[PDB]
């Protein structure tokens, strides 16, 4: 599942997961996930909180995001992008399932979103970067 997975796509707010692994070269237990976010929306999106959960055999860890908001889309310029790292410990090499909780505000509404991600690269190939 090497290619970038779209975790979220509504109201023109997209969140993708990008896959990698570290840090002992030797090991194949921790997956690095860079989660990138772009907006195409006409009104800006602010107060972004992305949470994640995993099954009891695994462990997830969310580093602070590069930011918390995105401007109204201005197609003329380079788009703004939020980027966040998350680390997924799974030494038992069990099946990979993740459940996110997305929170953001756009105009006067506040979206409280939840979804499942299952398209992870199989734990075997985590050593191979």
């Amino acid at each position: 599942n090497i290619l970038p997975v779209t975790v979220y796509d509504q109201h023109g707010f997209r969140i993708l997961f990008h896959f990698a692994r570290d840090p002992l070269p030797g090991r194949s237990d921790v997956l690095v996930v860079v989660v990138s976010m772009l907006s195409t929306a006409p009104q800006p999106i602010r107060n972004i909180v992305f949470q994640s959960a995993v099954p009891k055999v695994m462990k997830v860890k969310l580093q602070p995001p590069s930011g918390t908001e995105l401007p109204a889309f201005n197609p003329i310029v380079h788009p703004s992008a939020i980027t966040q790292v998350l680390l997924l410990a799974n030494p038992q090499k069990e099946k990979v399932r993740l459940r996110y909780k997305l929170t953001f505000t756009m105009g006067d509404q506040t979206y409280n979103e939840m979804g499942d991600v299952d398209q992870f690269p199989p734990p075997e190939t985590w050593g191979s970067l």
């Binding site: 909180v49 949470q51 959960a53 995993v54 009891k56 997830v60 969310l62 995001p65």
Partner: peptide, 8 residues
């Protein structure tokens, strides 16, 4: 099942 959700 699974653990609780995790924040930043």
């Amino acid at each position: 099942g699974w653990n609780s959700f995790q924040s930043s």
